[PDB]
Amino acid sequence: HDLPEGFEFMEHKVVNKDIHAPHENLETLRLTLTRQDEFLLREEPVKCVTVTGTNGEYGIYPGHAYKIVQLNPSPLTVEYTDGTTKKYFVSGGFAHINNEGSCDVNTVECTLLDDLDLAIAEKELAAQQAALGSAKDDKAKSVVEIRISVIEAVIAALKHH
Amino acid sequence: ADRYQVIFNRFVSAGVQRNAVYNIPSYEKWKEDLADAASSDNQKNRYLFAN
Amino acid sequence: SSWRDHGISYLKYLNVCTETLHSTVKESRRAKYERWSKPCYTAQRPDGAGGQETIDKVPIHTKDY
Amino acid sequence: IALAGVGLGIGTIFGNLLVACARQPNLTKMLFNYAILGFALTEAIGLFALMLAFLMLFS
């Protein structure tokens, strides 16, 4: 009746480094990207990862100090040591940075920037703007503002490149 | 609520299915335990993450 | 931004953002992504008569937030 | 007057020390030692001025 803890099935535990330990110069960062409980990268070695948190943008490189970031709807960039850039777009979630050389970005929804379309965003933005005036109450206005902000961020990311 | 315990089923292989449990300590007491993980040497795996 | 002042929780904010993101996906991939948002569920309690009295503790759809 | 920039400098080090100890309690040994090492490299400058003061006060 010793209920096996669900985490025990997952043997890929997090590698945390002790404070007093000697330093190691790392050349790659182990990135773990997850969408709706589905990982796209499994401890992939990358040169750097750019993530847009609440306060601002962050460029995470190997050896970055341990930190927790609350992401916002925005693009995410991954640059490999080879010299290849891969861009996704996330709607939210958290990013955990470890001083040991790991970065786990678990987002509610992470989709390729290519999969998104421009005209679809434009029409949706117009509809939300029209519906904002006809908002039932304050809560509806805030919800529409959230939707508008997400669409604007998507459009800005597409127009950037 | 002191805790929320989710009991579900886990699928190891095509036929080996077991019962698994997720415990979610209520925030109020999770904050208190995160305190011990930040100060005392106790809980070393959760020292950096806690900090 | 302004949704916190109205009592909306963070999880509901995440759900709305994901639903909007899915609505912005192309038609082809929308077949898959849109499945990951549709809230097809309810909350019920069986009563003495056997009827499944539906509960209203939490809204199901985003529009009900 | 040079001591004004010295006494303040010490407070800055100790001010940072408390913050550092708050977010890395285990590594108090390194932080405290470095604080006292710097306090001596700021006290030196304080002694620099004090010597000139005594020279211009007793001569």
Curated annotation (Swiss-Prot), chain C:
The answer, when asked if Transport is one of the entry's keywords, is yes
Q: What is its main location?
A: mitochondrion
The reply to whether Repressor figures as a keyword in the UniProt entry is no
Q: Which is one GO molecular function term here?
A: proton-transporting ATP synthase activity, rotational mechanism
Kindly list the GO CC terms recorded for this protein: mitochondrial inner membrane; proton-transporting ATP synthase complex
As for what it does, the entry says: Mitochondrial membrane ATP synthase (F(1)F(o) ATP synthase) produces ATP from ADP in the presence of a proton gradient across the membrane which is generated by electron transport complexes of the respiratory chain. F-type ATPases consist of two structural domains, F(1) - containing the extramembraneous catalytic core, and F(o) - containing the membrane proton channel, linked together by a central stalk and a peripheral stalk. During catalysis, ATP synthesis in the catalytic domain of F(1) is coupled via a rotary mechanism of the central stalk subunits to proton translocation.
Q: Describe the protein's quaternary organization and the partners it interacts with.
A: F-type ATPases have 2 components, F(1) - the catalytic core - and F(o) - the membrane proton channel. F(1) has five subunits: alpha(3), beta(3), gamma(1), delta(1), epsilon(1), plus the additional subunit P18 (Tb427.05.1710) that is not present in F(1)F(o) ATP synthase from metazoa. Subunit P18 (Tb927.5.1710) interacts with the alpha subunit with a 1:1 stoichiometry; the interaction is direct. Subunit gamma is part of the central stalk. F(o) has three main subunits: a, b and c.
Per its record, how is this protein called by name?
ATP synthase subunit epsilon, mitochondrial
